[model samples]
Target chain A: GTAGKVIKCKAAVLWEQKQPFSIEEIEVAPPKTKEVRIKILATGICRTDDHVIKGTMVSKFPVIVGHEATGIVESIGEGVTTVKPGDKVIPLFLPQCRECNACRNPDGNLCIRSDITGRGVLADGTTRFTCKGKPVHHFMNTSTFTEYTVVDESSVAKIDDAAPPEKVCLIGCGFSTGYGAAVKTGKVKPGSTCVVFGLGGVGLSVIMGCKSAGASRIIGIDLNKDKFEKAMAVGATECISPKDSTKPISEVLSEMTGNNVGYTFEVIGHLETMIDALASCHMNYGTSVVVGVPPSAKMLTYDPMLLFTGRTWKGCVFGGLKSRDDVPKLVTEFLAKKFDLDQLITHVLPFKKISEGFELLNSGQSIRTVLTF
Target chain B: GTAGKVIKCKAAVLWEQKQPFSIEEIEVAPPKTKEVRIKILATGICRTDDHVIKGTMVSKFPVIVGHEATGIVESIGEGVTTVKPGDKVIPLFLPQCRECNACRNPDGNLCIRSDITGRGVLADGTTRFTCKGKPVHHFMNTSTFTEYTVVDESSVAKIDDAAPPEKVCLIGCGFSTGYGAAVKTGKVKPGSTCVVFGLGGVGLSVIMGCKSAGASRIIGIDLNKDKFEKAMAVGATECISPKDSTKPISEVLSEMTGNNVGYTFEVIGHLETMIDALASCHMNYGTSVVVGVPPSAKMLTYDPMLLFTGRTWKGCVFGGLKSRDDVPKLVTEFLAKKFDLDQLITHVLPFKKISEGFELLNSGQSIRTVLTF
Candidate 1:
C-alpha cells in the first residue's frame, strides 16, 4: 500500500532551451518491469541541471532537471528483488548491474550498459512520465525533481534511513565526481601534496577526498574568498584566490610547495584552469586529474615534453565511480563517520521552494541546496 | 697491458652548424678507470647524427657525431670489469647501471647513468678524445666513426663476435628505438592491428617489433615508393604511400579497421602524422606511442574528448629501453632469431666515406648505413 494519498505532484519542468522552469502537475507512472517507484525525500541542484536547462549540455527538452536525489521505495515491478517497499534509498544517476562485464572485471568501469543508460531513458528506450499522454524526456534517467520517479532496479541503492536525506543526496553527483577523481582516478597517495583548483562543490569534495586518502598538504585555489573558510574547514591546508594577482597560479603553487605539487585537480572546466592544474604538478612525476566539464568543444593544448618528464594529464568521469561497488563503500564511509557529508549540504529547502533553491545555487550562495519533499 | 698503440684516428667532426663534416686526425686517450678502448669495427649513420650535424639537435661543438656502433674491446682500464680486452661489444647511447630507480622499476626505461652517459663523457664529466691537446666532446657516449673509441665499462655489451659488426651496429639506436616502441611501449598483443606512420629505419623496426610481438595486421605508411618493398620485406602486411592519395591516412585506417587501429606508432615527428596516429586508434581504450622527436618545442593540440573516450597518447624516449637490461635482452632476442637485424643495414661504407653515408641518410637513399673501420 502507498504510504501517502494520491495528489497532483508539482515538478519544475524545462519546456525549451534557456527558458524558465514551468512548475506543473505531472502524472507518476507505477513501477514496471525491473523498475522501482520512489517517493522523493530530497534532491540536490547541480550545475549539470543548469547546463541542460540552458542547452549547453545536450539532452532532450520538455524534461525534469534533477538527477541527484534520496527517496523511499514505494513499490517494485516484476523480477525485482534487490530492494523492497519502505526501504530508504539513494537514487544513482549512473546505475550499474553487478552482472555486467565492467562490474565483474577489475579496472573495468566502462560498462556495456552505459550506452543505453545515457539516453536518460530506461534500458527499453522509454520513459514513464507523461503530461496528458504526451511523453516528456527524463533528465539523466532519474527525473529526481519530480515528487515521484520511476527508475531501473539498478539505479537505486538502499541506505540507512537515519542518514540525513539532504546530505546523502549529494553522493549522486558532485560528491562522487570530486571524491572519486582524487581517491580513485588520481590515486592520491598518503602524505603527498595536492592542489585543487576551483573551490566549488566538486573542488571542496576533492579536498575531503584527498584528506580521507591521507594527503598531507592540501592547497585550494579559487577566484572567490568566500570559499576559503569552507575550503579550509573541509581540508585545505592553504588557499589562494586568483583575483588577488596576475602571476600564474601554478607558479604560486610551485612557490608554496617548494616544487610542484604531487597531485593537482582541475575542478573548473575553464581551459586556463586545466592548464594551471597540469602545470602545478611536480616536475618529474606528478599526475593531474581533470574532473571539470569544459564549456567548449575546443581542443586542449599542452607541451608533449611534460609527459616525457613524467607528468601526466588524465580526465575522469563520475569520479571513476563503479556504481555497484563504490556506492556501497561510499555510503558505508558516510555512516562510519569517515566522510564529512553534513558539511557538504549548506542549505535545504522544502519542495515548494525548489525554484528558489536553484536560484541560490546559480547565485553561488550555497555549496549545495537540497529540496526536501 | 695495452693491446694496441695510441692510434691517430681519422674522424668526422661537426665544427660548425650547416658546415660539411671535417675529416681530421685526432689523438685518442689511453683507457682510464672503468674505461674500455675499442677499435671501431663498424658504425651506423642515424637521423639523430644528421640532426646534430645540422644543429637542429643540440650537441657540443667539434663533437664526433655517431652513436650506433659495434666493436671489439681492444683494451680495458685497470678498474674495468664488465667486458674483457678481447670481448666483442656493441656501444649503447644509453648506459644502464641496474641500480638506478628507472633501471630497477619495470615501468620506466630511463637509465640511472644516462645523464652523464649521454653527454659523451664519463660520469665524472671528462672526455677521452683530444685534438692538439684540446678536448673533444663525445657524441652519444659512443664515437664509433673513428678507428679507436673510448667508452665506460657499462656502455658496452659483449655480443657473439660471429654476428656481423655492420649489421649489429644498428642494434644500438634505430633498431632498439623502433623495435622497443612496438614490443615494449605499445605492447602490441597477438592478432591485433597496428599502423606505423613512417617506413624509415625506426618505423621498419617498429614493424619488425610488432611482428616479433605477434601482431597479426601490420600496416606501413610512407611517402616514398622505394620504402614500400623494403617495409613489406621487414614485417608489414600492407603498405600505404601518402603520395597514393590526398585523403587523410587516419581516414583510410579508420575505414579499413571499421573504427580505428588497435595500435599506432608515429615515427615521423610532424604534427599531422602525430594527430593522425592519435586519431587512428581503437575507441574506448587504445594507446598511441610517440617515438619521434619533434623538431620544434611546440605544444601538441588534440580534442580533450579523445582522452575521455579512453584513448591515450604518450611519448617514449629511447623506446623505454634500460640499455644495460634491455640491450642484453635485445641481443638475446637477436641470438634467438626473434628479430631480423641484418635486413636493417642496407648500406656499408668505409669510415673514410662516412660523409657520403650521412649524405645518403639525409637524402633518404638508405634504410641504415653502417661505416666499417
Candidate 2:
C-alpha cells in the first residue's frame, strides 16, 4: 500500500521539448490538502500529448505527460471528500472544481481552477513528483504518465467499479472531447446533415455522437483514405478526402448537400481545416464547432462575413461536459451498451513500449494506443 | 397619383466612390413582376450610407443609397398579393422569399434570394431608376433616399397605419438590428451584465434591449462621453470610455464586472472593436454578438483559444429576424409603447436637407437624423 508514503515508481518523463519520453524511477509525493494520490492502471496515447512533445502546445518540461487514464485511488488528503482509497476514477485534464462560477453555471464546463497552461503545478503552485532527486512537473493537471500520481481532488472523476481500465481510460479525454462536442456543443439535430473534418479518434467519436443524435447524414473528411473503413464502422455515412476534389471542400460540400448542412466540426487541429469546417456549413443556419485546438499563439484569419451572414462559431473544452458530474454517467452509459469503445482501440502495449504507441500515432497507423502499467 | 406610372423623384445619388451624395431628378419606373413600388414618407441617415460614400462598403456608382425608411405602397406588380396601394411598409434590405430553404427553417434568416452582395439589380437583373439618361443602381434592396423606390414584393413588410413615419423608420434598420440582436440572438438572461461597443443609434438600442430583457447592469462603451447621458437615459447602468483606461478595454471591463460579463455587442464597424468586444466577455459561457459590419474584404485575426476555452461567437443579418414576418410585429410592439423611439432621433430634417443629416451623423452630433419627405 502506497498510502501516506512517497511511492518510488517507474514513470515516463519528458526532459525537454521535442525529446523522446524517458522511463525513469521517480518519487511521487503523498497528496497534500485537497488532493488525492492515484495509482494509474492504464493510460491512452493522445494527439495532445504529442503536441506537447512537438512543442506545438506549451507545457513545462521534465513533466509527466499523459492525461487520458483510468486509475485507483491510492489515498486521500485532509480536505478530500469525493473519494477515498480503493475507488476507481478517471483523471480529468479539465477539472470540475464544482465550487467555481464556471463549474456552477449550466452552460459552463471550463473550471476556473484549471491550470491548463501554467508552470505544470497544481492549485497550490507546487509539484508532487521528483526524478533523479530533482522536481518533475505535471501536464494538463492530470499527468497520468506515472504509475502513481498525486492530483487535486477536483481533477478526479469517480466512475463505476465495473468499468474496464484500458477501455474506459479514453473517456478521460479523446472520446469524451469528440462525443460531447457533437452531442453537447454542436447539438447535432435529428435528421440534419453533419460534416466532420479529420477521421482520428475524436472525429470518429463525433460521427458516433452525430449518429446517436439521429443525424441522417454524417460526412467524414480526411486525407487518409485508409481510416475511412473505421470511420464508417463508427457512424460516418460517407468519407471524402480533400485531395479528391479540385474545388474547395466547402464548395464541394455545398453542392453535395444542396447547401443544407446544419453542423460542421473541425477535429483536425489545423488552421486550413478549421476554416473549411466553418465555411462548409450552410451559410444561413449552420453551426461550426472548433473541437481541435491549434498551436498556442497561433491566430486564425478569416473573412468576418462568414460569421456575419448568420453563422455561429463555438468552442469548448472536455466536450463541454462537466467532468465531475458527467464522466461517471458516460461510463454508466458505456456499461449499458450505448456504444462500442472497442472500435477505437487500435493497439495495446506495455508501459515500457509507450514510444511505439506514439510512433503509431505519428505514422497515422493507430486511432489510439493504450499503454498498461 | 404614381400608381402604374413612372414617378420623377428628387433623390440623393452617389456617382462614384468617395464622392458626396448629389441630389438628382431620377425617374423611378413602375413596379415589375413580383415587385412593389413605394413612396418614401421618411428615411433615416445611417452610418452604412457613409460606408458607401467613403468607399469602405462596395456598391455600384450612381446608386440610390438608403435602407432605413418607412413608406406607403404606391403601386404593386401583377404577382404582388401581400400589399396594395396605400399600405404603409418598411423595405427590407434582407428579404424573406418565403419559398426559399432558408426562409422555411426557423433558425434561418438570411434568405438565399437575398442579393446582399450582388451587382445592384433585382431578380430580373435590371435597375428600376434612371438619372441623367443613365440607369441608377439600387443599394441594399431597399434604397429609400428617394421619393419612390421599387423593391421585390418579398422585401416589403406592411406595418400599422398608426405607425409614425419618422419614428418607425428606425425600426426598419438600426433599432430592430440592435434590439433583436440582444433579444433574439443573445437571448440575454435577466440580471446579467452586457457591454455595448459603440454609443450610436444601434448601440443605444442594444442598451434598451438589454434593459428590456431585465439585465441588471448595462455597460455602454464609447470614446464620446457626450453620448453617455443618452445611453443612461435609454437604460445603460453605467458608461465607460476606452480613452480613460491605460489598460486594454477588455481588462478594464473584466475588473469592473468581476469577470461576469454575460453578453457583448460590437456596434462599431471596426475590426479592432469587434475583436475587443469578443475578448471583453467572460472566457467561459460568455456570448459576443457581431452586429456591425467591417469594411468589405477585411479579415479578422484573433487567437483561437478565446473561443476554444468556452465562448460563442455569433452574427446575424437584420438582427437574425425574418424581415417580412417580424418587422410588422416589431412595428406593432413599438406602437404599443414598449419602448421610446424618440430618444433614438437626435434631429429631424426635411428629406431635401438630407446632406445636413449626414453632416450631423459625421460630426457625432446626432444619434439618428430622420429625414421627412
Candidate 3:
C-alpha cells in the first residue's frame, strides 16, 4: 500500500491557458489530514475542462484539469473516516463540507469549501502535485486527469461497489448536473412543457430528467440538427432549430407552445442562450434554470420585467446536489435501474488518448467520451 | 340605478405625460358587456401614480392615473355576475381571468387579460370615459382616480359588506403588495433572517409579514433613516442605512448577517438597488424578491454567477396574490385582526385634497395617504 508515500503517476497537465494538455510524469503527494488519495478508474471529458484551457473558465496553469471521474480510494489521511482503502468513489468539484452553512440548510448544496473561482489551490492553499519540479495547482478541487489524485474528504463521495466506472463516471458531473437541474432545481411539474436550449450529453440528460418527471412535451433547441435524433431517442418530444425562424426563438417557442412552458433549461454556456432560456419560459410561473456555466466575468443583461411577471430565474452547480451526500444515493438509484447511464457514453478511449477524447468532444462527434485508466 | 345609462363624474385626469392630475368633469359610460361601474369610496396614493406622471411608467395621455381603491358597485353590465349594485368592491390592477394558463396553474396569478404593457384600453380596445369631449383612457384596468370608474368584472373583487373602505383600500395595492411579497412570494420561514430594502408602506407591510411569519431577525435598509422608527415599530429587529458604508451595501449586509440572510426584498424601484438586493442575500439558498417596479425599458445587468451559485432572483406583481380570489380573503384576514392596516395609513384626506396627499407621499412624510370621497 502506498498509504504514507508520494506516488509517481502519469497525468495530462496544461502548462498554461490556451494550451492543450501535455502527457507528463507527475509526483502526487500522500493525502494530508482530512484528505484521501484516489486511483482514478475512469473519467469523462467535459466542456468545462475545455473552458479552462480556453481561459473562459479561469484556472491557474500547471494544473491537472478533469473533474468528472469515478475512482477507488487508495488511502485515507488522519481524521478522514468516510472512505478508506479500496472504496469506490466519485470526486466532487462541488464539495459538501457538512459543517458549512450551505450544508446545513435543506435547500442549499453549494458548500463553503468549494472553489468556484480559479483559486487553483486546495483548502490549505497549496497543491499536492509536482511536475518538472514545479508545483501543479489543482483544478476545481477534484483533479482527476492524473492516474492518482489527492482530494479533501469533503470532495470524495464513496459509491456502491457495483457501479461500473466506465458508465457511472458521467454521474460525477454532467449527468447529475443536468438530471438534477430538472428533477431538483427546476422541480419541473408533470403535464407541463419543458424547453432545453442545448442538446449535448448534459442537455439530453436534462431531457431524460424532464421526461422522467412527466413533462408532456420536451422541446430541444440546438443549431446542430445532428444532435436532434439522439436527443429524441432519449426523451425529447420535438426539436427545433432557431435558424428556421426570423423571430426570436423565445417568441417562436411562446407561439409554438401557446405560452404554457413550465420550465426552461439553458445547458449551453453562451450568454445569449442564457437570456433566451429565461425569456422562453412562461411569463407567470415558469422556472428558468441556468444549468450552463456562462463565460466568467461577463454581465448577464435582461429585462427585469421577465422576473417581475412572476418567472423564477435560478441556477445551481452540480444540479443543486449535496455532493457527498447525494452522489452515492444517485449511484444506488443507477444500480436499481431508475435511470440509464449507458446511452450517454458515446465512445471510450484509453487514458493516454485523452487528447482524442477532447477532439471528439470539440468536433461534437461524441456526446461523452469516457477515458479509461 | 345607473344601469344602461351614461353618468357624469369628477375624475383626476392626466391630459399628458409628466403632467399632474387635473380634476375635471368626465362622462362615465354605463358598464358595457362583462363590466361594472363603481362609485369610488376611498383610494390610496401610491408611487405608481407618480410614475405615470413622471413618464417612468408609461400610459396614454388623457388617462385616469390611480389603481388602488375601494368602492361600491354602482351598476353592472350585461353578463356581469360577480358583483351587483351596492356591493362593496376593490378594483384590481392585476385581474384574475381564471380561464388563462396562468390562472389555471396553482403557482401562477398573472392573468392573461391583465394589461402589463401601458395599453390604455380594455379588452374591447376602447375607453369608457370621455373628458372635455376627448376619449379618456383607462389605467391598468382599475383607473380609480375618480368619483365613479368603469372596470371590467375581471378587474373588480367584491369584498365584505362590513369592511372599512378607507383602511381596506390599502389592501388594494400597497399593503397587499408588500405583505404578500414576504408572506406569499418570499415564503419567509420561521427563525430566518430577512432584509427589506425600503421602508414605505409596502416595505413596512413586508416587515409586518416577516414578523408575523416568525422571522428571527428583520433588518430594514433605506437611505432615509427617518423610515427606521416606523419600520422597527412594524417588526424590524434593526435598521441600517446603505450610505453608512463606503463599500457596496450588499457587502455590508453580507458581513452584517455572516452571509445567512434568508430573504431579501427590493421595495424601492431603482436598478442599482435591485442588483444590490440580489447580492445582499445568502448565495446558496437565499431568495431575493423584487417588489418594486423599476423604470420601463431599462436592462438589469448583474453577474450570472450570483444565480449560478444557487441564489434565486424573482419578482412579482401584486405580491403573487391571485387577484379577486385573494383580495377578499386578505380583507377577511384584516377584519379578523390577523394584520393591521391602520399603521400603514399615516394620513387620510378628502378626495378633493388629492394633490396634497401626493405631496405627502413625495415628501416621504406619509406611509400611506387614504383619499376618501
Candidate 4:
C-alpha cells in the first residue's frame, strides 16, 4: 500500500533556547490520512523563529524551527483530495479550512484547522515526525525548515509552479503577516494614511499591503536609517529614523503625514513602540493594530479617555489569517502580480550560512533572509 | 420684539463648593438670536448637579445648578424655527442642532452647538442671567432651577404638550443618559443579556433601555437592596446586591448569564465598578459603556490587552445623541409608550421646595425628585 519510499532528511533542530541550530539526519515519517509529505525546497527565517530559539515564546523544545517555506508535495495520504503527490505547494503556517467559522466569514482569519494543529500535534495528539525513535515536536504546526515535512492537507496550499520558491516562501509568514496586518487587519482604505513602525520584513510587507490597498500616504519609522531606502523602494512615501528625530516618531509621523495617520501598525515588539503606534493615530477616529508580541509581561497602560475620542486599539495574531482560506488567495494574488513577494526576499543564503542570517537580522541589516535547503 | 415681559427670577446658585445652595434674585435677559425664554415648569434633581455642589465637577462660582427640566417657552428671538411662545419643551444638557456635523453623522454625538452652550453661555461667550450686576454662570446649558431660563432654540426640544411636566422632566437628562447608554451607545441587541453596575437612576434607565431593546436578561448590581425592587419593576430580570454577595458581582454575573453578559453598563462613577463592568462582559466579544462621569481629576486605568480579547470600553455622552435628531426621537418614543418614564419620578415638590428635594436626593432616598415651579 505504500507507494512512496521513506526519505532521509537533513534538518535544523533547536535542542534548547539560545543555542546554535544543530544540523541532524532525521527519518521522515509516512503521511497518514488527510496528510501530505512535502520536500521543502526553501525556508524563510522570521524573527518569530528566532523568538522560539531564544525561548521568548513558550513552545515544545527539541523542535524543528521554521514556519515560513515553499515546498513540493512528494506524497499524499489517504483521503487527501486537495492535492496530488506532485503538486507544488507553499506550506502555510496557518491552515485554512473553509468550513471553519472564521474561514467562512469574509473578515475572519482564524481557521479551526489551524487552531487544532497549533496545539502541536494532530487531533489525536500524535507527532508525524520522529528522531531516533523519539517523537520531535512541530513548531507552529508547520516544520518547513527540514528537507522533508509532513503536515495536514489543509495546511499546504498549491502555488504557481513558475513562481520562485525563495520568494514565495515568504508568503507563508512575514509577507502575510505584514500585508494582512495592513490590508486585512487594519483595513487600510484607499486614500488613507498609514504608519508602519518598523522597516523589518513584516513592516515592509505592511508597507506593500498599504500600497496595494491604495493608501495615499505610507510613512515608515525605524531607528536605523539603512531601512529608509528599502522602505521607499517598496511603497513608503516617507521614511524617518527615530534616532535622528528630536521629537518622538509619532510626532514626526504626524508632522510628515499632515495628521495622525489613519492607521498605525506596530511591528517591533516593544512597549514603547506599541504606545507610539497607538499615540500616532489621528486624534479622531483612528485605529492602531498591534501585531508585535512584546517580550516583557508588563501590562499596556494608556489613558482610558483616549477611547472616548473614537480611538481603537486592537491586537492581531498572524494578521488574523484564516490560513486555509487566505493562503490560497495570497498565493494566487502573488502569481497574479498584485502583491510583491520578490522584494521581501532581500537576501538568500544557503542552509549552511544560517548563522550569518541571524547575525544580519540581529544587526537590523536585512529585511528578510531566506535559507535555501 | 419681545412677546412676553422680561422678569427677575429667584434661583438656587452655587456660590462655593460644599456650600448650601444660595437662593438669589437673578435678572433674566431677553432671548437673542435663535434663543427662547422659558418659564421653568419642572426640574429633576440629578447626581451631576450634586457633583457640581460637591465641587467634584468643575464649574464657575455662582453657577446656576440645575440641568434637567421641562419648561414653557415664554418668548422666542428672531429666526427661532424650532419652538415659539407657548410651546412646551424639555431642555437638554447637550443641545442637538440638526445642521451641525456631529448632529448629521450617524455615529457622532458631539454637537458643536451643545458644546458651545455647555460653557454656561451662548457660543459667543456671554451669559443671559446676572445677579446683583455680577455675571452668574449657567450650569450644563440648562440652568433649570432658575424660575426663568433662556436657552438657544437648539437646546429645547418641543415635547407633546399633553405630556405631564413632572414626569417628562426626568427625560431631559437622567432618563435620556441611561436609556441612550444602553440602546444607542451599547447598541444592545435583542436576545442579548446585560448587566448594569448600578441600579440608581442611570442604571435603572439602562435596564429600561435594555428591556425596550428586547434584552433577554437584565442583571442589576448595586450596594443598595432598596433599589432592586425599582430595578426589577423597570426591566431587570435579576437583581443582586454586591454588598451581600461573597463573590464579586462580575463573577456572579458571568456564572448566571452563561458567560459574561453581552453588554455591561457602568452607571456608577467609581473605578472599581468600571473594572467590574468590564469583567462582566461575555468572552470573545462584549462591549461595556461608561455612562457615569467619575470625579474630574480621577483617571481610569486598565490592562490594554483586554481589548485584544475582543472586549471594548466606550464612553456614552448623552447616549451618543446628536441632540437635535435623537432628543426628538427619544421624546417621540416616550410619547409612543415605548419607554417607561412616569415610573422614574419618585416624588414631585413645589418650586420653593427645591432644598427639600435636594436633601431627599442627597440621602439617596428617591429615584428622582421633581421640583414643580
Candidate 5:
C-alpha cells in the first residue's frame, strides 16, 4: 500500500562523474501509477556500476548506481499488479514491458521503454528520489544501491521465497548473463566441447551452465595461473594460461579440442578476448557468445574468414534473459543447489561498508561483494 | 559400363603456375577401384577456375581445371554402384563420402574427403589425366572441362534429365550455393524479411531462394544502380544504392527494414562486405550468412558489441549443402520451376569459347556463361 506515503532511506549516490559514491539520506517518494517501492535486502557490486562512476561510461550525475539487487516489496503504486506488498523480488536494469515489440519477440530483449528508463529517470522522464530537496536520478530503472527504491511494475520480478537475497541478487546480472548465454544463446548441447575465455566470476558461471548442459570438456583460459585451479575445481576439465604461449589463444584451443569446440564464451570486455572466443570455435558451426559488456568506444578486428567458415558468433546482455520469466526459474535453480555460488560470494558486508565493497571490486580483490542493509 | 580400358581426351591443362590453361589432348587412365569415367557434356565457367590458373594454387603440373559441369556416365570402376553407364549426372567440386564422420553429422557439409579431393588428385594422391607423357593433376576430383574425365564414385550426382545440362550446370556451384544458403544454412522461414548485399549471379540466386522461401520483403544493395531491376525481377522487394549516402550500407538497410531484418547475405567476398552483411542484420536474433569467399589474408574488424546485442554471424561454403544429398534436390526443384534459372545464365557458349568465358567472368562482363563440349 503505497498510498500517500514517503520513506526516508540511505542510498550510495554518485554526485558526479569520476567521483566517489557518497552514502547519504534520500527521501524515496511513494510509488505513483504503475510503480513499486522496494526495500532492498541485498545487492551485488556489478562492474558496470564501477565503470560508470569511473567515467568509462557516461551517465547523468547525482544518480543512484546499482542494477543488481534483490529486495522485498514495500508498496505498490496505482495500476501496479506485477507485484504486491511483501513480495520477494529482483529489480531488473533491463525491464520487460511484455507489450513492446521487443517483449513480444522470443529473441528480442531490448525494450523500447528501456531507452528512456536507462537515462536515470522513469518512463515519464523524472526521478522519485530527493536528497535534502535536490533531485536524485534513477539508474538503469533499478537504483538498488539505495535502501529503498521505486521502479515501474514491469521492472520488478517477483520470485518465490525459496532462495535468499544474497544468492538470487547475483542472478540480476552476472550469474544470469553467463548461465543464460550458455543455455539460451549458445544452445550448448550435452557431451559437446566448450572453451571459455576469461575467468571472471561471470566466466566461472558460464562453466556452471556448461556443466549443467553436460558438456564433456570445459576448457577455461586465463592470463593468470591462479584462476586455473579454481576454474578446474568448478567444472573446467582443462585450464590454460596464455602467458607462455606463442600462438593465439584460438589456435591453442582448437588443437585441444580437435578443431571441434562446440561452444566458446568471452566474459571479458576486451576486444581481443571477444575475437579470441569467436575464433576458438569449431571450423563448422561452432557458436560463441560475448557475455561481457565491451569497452566503450572500442572496436574488435578479426579475419572475416573465421566467421565465414561455419562459425556463429553472438553477444549476450544479462545472459539474453527474459527477466519476468527467467529470473524466477534461475532463483529456483539456485535453491536446488544446482551450481556453486558459495565460492563466488567472496565478501559480504553491511550498507555502512558499501564503499569498501566497491574498493574490493575495483582492486579485483573479490569475485563478488554482496551488500545488505 | 566402365570397361577395363584407357581413354584419350582434350582438357584445358594448367602446365605451370601463373600460366594460361593449354587446351590440348591428354591421355586418360582407366578408372581404378571405386572410380568412374565421365563424358562431360557442358560446364559453367566459374571464377575459381580462372583464378587458380593465374595464381599459386598448387597442383601436379598439366592439371585440368573445371568443376561445375554436368555429364554422362561413360564407365564405372569396381564397386561403383551409385551410378551406371549412360546416366545423366553432375560432378561436384565438393564430394560427400557417406562413410566419413563429416557426412554422418547433420551440420557436416565439409567432408574429410573434401580437402584431398580439392588437392587436384584422387584420394590416393594420383592423377588420371597426363600430358606429354608426364603425370598431370585432376582438379577437385572432377575435372569436367575435359571431354572425358575420371572421378571417385562419391563425387558424382545422378540427376534426372528434365532441365538442360547447360542450365543445371550452374547448380554444381553458384546456384546451389545461393539457394542452399537461404534454405539450408540460414534456415530461413517463410514471411521473413531478407537483405541480400551484392547483385552478381550468386546474389540473384539468393534472391530467387528468398522468394521461394516466402520472404515478405527482400532488399537488394549494391553500388551499381543498374542491378535493381534485375534483382527485383528475381525477387527483391526493394533496392538501395550506398553510392549516394555516407552511412555504412548496414545502417541504411536496417533503417529500411525497420531495424529487424530476419536475414542478410554477403555475396561479395570483400572483408568490408562481409562485415556489412553481418552488421546489416536486425539487432534481435537477426542472422547473416557470409556467402562470398573472403579475399586472401584480409582482416575484418567491428565493435564486439555488435554481436553482444543479439545478432548472429555465420559464413557459408557450398551453401552448407551435403553435396551427395542436396545437389539433386536443388536440380529437381529448379526443373519444377520452384524458381527461375533462365535469367541467371546470361550467356551460353561452345567449349571452344571457354577461354573467352573466363575472360568475361574475370572482367565481370558476363553474369554466368554456359560452356558446352
Candidate 6:
C-alpha cells in the first residue's frame, strides 16, 4: 500500500557550492521501478562532503549533500522486493547491479553502474528532489543530507533494526572502505605488523580493522598529535607525528617496527604519503593499501626498483566491499561486539547545526559528526 | 679437504664497460672461508649481463661477466657444508644467509648479504681473478663466464644429481625470476588470464609459469613476431606485436580479450610498457609484475589513480622467490619434466665465442645461450 506516492518533507539542501546547506521544505518524488523512497534518520559528516562543498570535487551545485547515511524506507517503487516501508537501511553512494560482471564476480565491487551513479542521478538520468518547483541534483546518488531521497533498490542494503542509525550510517562509506581495505584488499594476516598513515575516521578505522584482523602491532602515523590518543585507544600499538620524527617516517618505521610492515595504509590523499606508504612496506611481500582520494592530474613518480623486490601497491573503494553482499554482515560485526563504534563518534549535532558539523570536521576536531534529522 | 689453492683458467673477461668480452687466461684464487671454488659447466647469458656490459647497470670494469650458471663444486672452503666437492650447483647472484631477518622470514628471499652480494666480489671485498697480474673484479659474484669461479657458500643451490647443467643453468636468473614472478609474486590464479611483455627468456618463463599455475589464457606481446614460435610452444596461448596493431596494445588487448587480464608481466624494462601492462588488467585484482631492469635515474611517471581501484603493481627480484628454499624444488621440478628448459636453450657456444652470445641476446634472436668451456 505504501507505493508510488509523492510526499513533502523537510531537508537540508545545498543551493550553491561553498555555501551552507539551507534547511527548507522540499518535495520527494515517488520511487520509480526498482527504486525506493527513504526517510533519513542520521548521516555521518564525511570528508567527501567537505570536498564537494569546497569546490575541490567539482560537483553540480544545488544538490542535496551526504552519502554516508542510515535511514528508513518510507515506500517502494514497482518490483522492489529487497526493502519495504519501515525497513532500516544504509543507502550506498555506489550501486551494485548484480547483472554486471564486477557484481557477478569477486574481483571488484566497482559496479559498471558506477558511472551513472557518479553522475548523481538515477540510471535513467533524472532527479527526484525538487525545492520550490526547481529540481536539484542528487549528491553521490544517496543525498541523505535531505530528510528524504529516492535511490535505486540496488543501492540500499537493509540492515538490523536493532542497530543504532547514528553509528551504522558510517558503514555506508569510511568504515566500509577502511575495514575492507584491510580485510579484503590487503588481506591483513593474523600476527602481522601494520602501519597506518593519517588518523582521520578512515585511518583510525583502518587501525581497528587491522587490529580485529589479528595484526600484532599497529603503528599510526599522522601530522597532528591530537589524533594519536584516540587512534591508540582503538587499535594502534604505537602513534607518532611526522613532525616529531628526525628521519623519514618510512625509514623510521623500518628501524622501529622492523623493515617488513606486513600491511600499510594511506588515507591522507597526498602524493608524498602515497610514496611513503609504498616505501614503508617490507622488502618482498608487504602490501600497501591506498584509500586516499588523490588530487586530479597528479602523477605518482617512484623508482621501478622499489616494486621489483616484493612490495605491492593497491587502491580500494569502500574497502573493496561488494556492497549489497557485505553491509549486512558488517552490521552483525558491530552488534556482536567485534567492532567498536563508541570512540568513532566524536560529536553528534542536530539537523539545525548541520553547517556547524562541517566546521568541526574542517577544523579536524571530530572523527565523525553525525547529523541527526 | 679441499683448501686454499690458486689455478689458471680460460675466461671471457670484460676489460672495461661498453666493450666486448675478451678470452683470456686468468689465475683463479683459492676459496676463502664460507666460499667455494667451482668449475663452470654451463652458463646462460641474461639481460642483467647485457646491462653490465653496456655500462647501463654501472658495473665495475675489468670484471668477469655472467651471473646465471651451473657448475661443479671443485673445492669447498672452511665452514662450507651446503655443497661438497663433485656436487652440482647453481651459483646465485642473490644469496641467502638463513640467519638474516629477510632469510629467516618468508616475506623476502633477499638475505642480509644482499648489500655485500651486490658488490660483485668475495664477501671479504676482494677480487678472485687476476689477468696480466692485474686484479679482475667479479660480476654478480658468480662470474660464470670464466672456467672457474669462487662464490660464497650461501649463494649456491645444490640440485639433483641427474639434472643437465646446460639446460638447468637458466634457473639461476631469467627462468627462476620469471617463474617466480607469475607463481610467487603475482600469485597467478588457476583459470585466470595473463599477458607477458617482451617474450624474452624471462617473459617466456613467465608464460610457462602462468601455464603451470593453470592460467586459461596467455597473451604474448613483443616487437619481434619471430619469437612467437618458442613462446607458444612453451606456454603462450596467443601472440601479438604492438607495431602491427592499430590501437594501443593495451586497448587492443582489451578488445581482444575483453579487458580482464588477471596478470601482466613487464619484462621489457621500459616505463611506457609498464604503464600499459598495469592499465591492461581488470579494474580489480589484476596484478602487474615488473621484472625488467630499468635505467639509472629513470623515474617512472604514472597516474596514482591507476592503483586506486584494485590493480596492483609489484616488482620481482629473482622472481619473488626465496633462494635456497625454492631453487632446489624448482630443480626437482625441472628433473621431473615440470618445466621446459630443454627448448629454452636455443644456442650453445664455446667459452672463446661467448662475446658472440651477447650479441645474439641483444638482438633478441636467442632465448638463451649456454657457454661451454
lDDT by residue (tens digit), candidate 2, A1-373: 6678899999999999999999999999999999999999999999999998999988876889999999999999997889989999999888888887788788888887787675699989999999998999998889988899988888999999999999999899889989999899888889999999998988889999999898999999999999999998889889999999899999999988988899999998988788899998888799999988888888999988998887889886888899999999999999999878889999999989999999999999999999998
lDDT of 2 at B204: 93
- lDDT score of residue A40 within candidate 4: 88
Q: Looking at candidate 6, what TM-score does chain B attain? A: 0.95
| Residue A300, model 4, lDDT | 61
Per-model TM values vs. the true structure: 0.78, 0.99, 0.99, 0.82, 0.89, 0.96
lDDT tens readout by residue for model 3, A200-227: 9899999999988999999999999999
Taking all chains together, the TM-score of candidate 3 against the true structure is 0.99
Pairs in clash, predicted candidate 4: A95-A324, A96-A323, A96-A324, A109-A321, A109-A322, B96-B323, B96-B324
Clash pairs for candidate 2: none
**What tens digits encode model 1's per-residue C-alpha lDDT throughout A1-373?**
5533333577788887888778788877777788888889888888878877666667776788788888888888888988899988887766687775445544345555563223757778887777655777776658888888888888878887777777788888889889988888788888889999888788899998999899999999887788899999999888988777778777777777767378888887777787788778864456788788765467888776666544556677678788756776777778888778778788888877877877887777888888888
Cα lDDT tens digits, model 4, B1-373, are: 4464567879988787888887899898888888888988888988888888787778877789787888888889889888878988888778677764445546566566654223677755788888888988877777888998888777888888887788778778888889988877778888888888887777889898899899999988878788889898888987887776789777777778655367888898877677777777753356788887766666666654555444556666776666656666777777788777878888888878877888887777887888988
- Kindly give the stretch of ten consecutive residues in candidate 1 chain A with the minimal lDDT sum: A109-118
lDDT of model 4 at position B350:
84
- Residue pairs with backbone atoms closer than 3 Å in model 3 (clashes): none
